[PDB]
Design a protein around this ligand. Sequence first.
Ligand SMILES: CC(=O)Nc1cccc(-c2ccc3nc(-c4cccnc4N)n(-c4ccc(CNC(=O)c5cccc(F)c5)cc4)c3n2)c1
Length: 376
Amino acid sequence: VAIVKEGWLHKRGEYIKTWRPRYFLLKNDGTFIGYKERPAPLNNFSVAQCQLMKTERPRPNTFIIRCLQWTTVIERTFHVETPEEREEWTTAIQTVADGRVTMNEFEYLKLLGKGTFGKVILVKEKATGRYYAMKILKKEVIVVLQNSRHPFLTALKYSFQTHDRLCFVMEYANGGELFFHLSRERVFSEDRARFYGAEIVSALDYLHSEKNVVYRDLKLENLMLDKDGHIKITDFGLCKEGIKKTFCGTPEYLAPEVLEDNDYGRAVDWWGLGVVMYEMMCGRLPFYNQDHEKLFELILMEEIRFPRTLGPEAKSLLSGLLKKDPKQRLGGGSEDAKEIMQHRFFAGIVWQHVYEKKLSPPFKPQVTSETDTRYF
Ligand SMILES: CC(=O)Nc1cccc(-c2ccc3nc(-c4cccnc4N)n(-c4ccc(CNC(=O)c5cccc(F)c5)cc4)c3n2)c1
């Protein structure tokens, strides 16, 4: 509804290293967005439940908004000209911010991932023989939940805490990583890609619509398969911005407007969907270079050359999803996912059926039960 504070702030630029001035609006809902020039909400940019910290390194009058978002630590770093300015922002942000099991229950089998904020471990629950992923966050580094009712997101089974740790026991699919399946197969057929794309769209529609959340981390590495061959979108983020690549995320998948470090929204997920589906259908990334600066330039400046092997529906969809201007991009309007759901490439798809897992997988991984360790 209402703006509580507005004005310029220096924001640490994540991908193209800079302190760029952004015009920010703090709002009564918790929203805190920074536009390049003086200008539906997203919980990703909210300050609700966040931790505010004053520091003088690297620059004087710096502050940090650190948030635990679901199971992931998200940080943004800001700088102002004087200490009185800081206290004005920090007090305004602070005031607007207005609202079973233990380690012993599990066996620890394999390291799945590691970052500055913690670890993800392949785990087996002793009492049931079931396999999960435990995401273990370090309390020293950071200084009441209800799952999404959608089948292709990563559901949380348990949440608990030790004196120095936060532990999230979450689903872990045993049908293999899609990066592995695609590496072997070289390329997916358009119908194979249609099936995965439809399952991705359905999950992200849910996040965007029911949760007011952007994923922002769509990539082949974050997609795994069910025992049944259905999609699982992964929740293993551990990365901390600013320390050794010094940025978080896989740049090959990042939208131009994320790179520019302007405001962005739901359409960043559709750009991600475009890269992912392009990769499944062409067997290669749409933008690639060894050197990150050159890769960034390509994402921002270069138009794509689409292979001649691609049917006209696929090419239309991919060209739509990979438009640089987010307001022009497929799914970038007020309709969001609906724009993509009624694109011609998905002709015939019954979206309630996708949501209900009624779409038949083109590929079943070689696994007899949810307890099959073959892919681990
Ligand atoms: C108090 C609180 O938790 N707030 C909050 C703020 C923003 C998002 C969320 C939230 C809620 C439910 C969620 N479910 C998923 C999810 C997504 C995919 C698969 N399984 C899942 N369970 N998310 C979720 C998980 C990971 C991410 C990854 N985040 C980023 O990579 C990211 C990085 C920089 C900026 C940014 F906005 C996002 C985003 C959302 C969720 N995020 C919660």
